[PDB]
Amino acid sequence: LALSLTADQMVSALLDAEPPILYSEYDPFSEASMMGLLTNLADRELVHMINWAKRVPGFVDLTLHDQVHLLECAWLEILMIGLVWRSMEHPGKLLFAPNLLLDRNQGKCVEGMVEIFDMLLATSSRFRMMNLQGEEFVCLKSIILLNSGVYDHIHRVLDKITDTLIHLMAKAGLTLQQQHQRLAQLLLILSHIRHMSNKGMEHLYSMKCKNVVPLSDLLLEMLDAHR
Amino acid sequence: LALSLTADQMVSALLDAEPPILYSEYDPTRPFSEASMMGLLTNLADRELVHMINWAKRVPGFVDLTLHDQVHLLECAWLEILMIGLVWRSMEHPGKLLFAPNLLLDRNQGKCEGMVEIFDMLLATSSRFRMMNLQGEEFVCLKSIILLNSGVYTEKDHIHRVLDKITDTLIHLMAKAGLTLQQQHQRLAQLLLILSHIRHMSNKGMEHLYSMKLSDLLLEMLDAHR
Amino acid sequence: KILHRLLQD
């Protein structure tokens, strides 16, 4: 029952709960190579995301059914907003893994849209153009976890995370007009990340029954929630 | 440019630019098949699109964009604009979706063929606007945001400039409502977070419409999505 | 496209 936190207690707890940046197998590319390398990276990242979610203040206070629902609805959003964050300082490139840096060209090696690839490039470009901070990033990732699958306590946590995000802006010396304008620009991007997720979700469900790559046991169980 | 209007002039232009609420070619003496709802909601969405286009032209800043950009923004956001319009007029109808003054449906015929889930999500969205007492001035702002934001990526950073002015317009309403600064910007967040769910409902309904495959204009909008 | 014409009217 950790709703009493100050913003920096919320920030430091979220910063300390960050999963690590996992490495790929990366081989120094066909449609089977990429989809296989991203699948294994995704499956290994899912087990860290689960333990990260437990460490999100308020997530443990939910029942097991609700924790399952929130993760099943937001898990690709969370991977993509992480992908977009760690790709900031590689303009025009997506850093799936520190050894798996891809650009738009091989991003076309998948029948899945390169528009999704260019949407991720656009999203990371917007983060870079407005100097998105790591403290703000972990707040946005938390909001995805608690908001995407909401259909109270979660509404009291989202409000608190909003106050937290605005504490960051405050310090320092951006004006309220640009403080809630910055908040608005941040949250509107979450609308795009949800779009990239739905678009990406519908393609993973394609390669599911299309037998392109042996998926993971855990990865297929997330896809059974989007059907 | 034209984007020099005060927040209150912004509200007035949007309020006056509101499309009408159209009616359905609905026959209550006729029963409701899966294709009946499919045909009714399709014709109603199609006649609403021509009003949405002319409404979009009256949105401050939308005229400043090129024809290719206006086509793109409307091709990505049109089903979100119908849906939040649907959610808005279903506010005073708990447990029901008011597609049209004569077409008031509930979670019984909503199952009439694929996917109910969207229906409850629209209900929950309408229930969300009800519990937080969404005001019309706040609805016209969010609907404008959907038009400009959904396709900002899917030059023109003035779209961000107009978006900044709509944000300034939104909190301007809430400040003139007794809402503290804390209550003000967390309200703003609750509204913008709902736009995520509307994006989700639209993408779900979008891929459903492509599976069940009408209006010639509606088919031009579907070709943009995939 | 029908959409392109309606914006041009």
Place this chain on the structure above:
Amino acid sequence: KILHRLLQ
């Protein structure tokens, strides 16, 4: 479901 055990 695998997600159940991983969360407990």
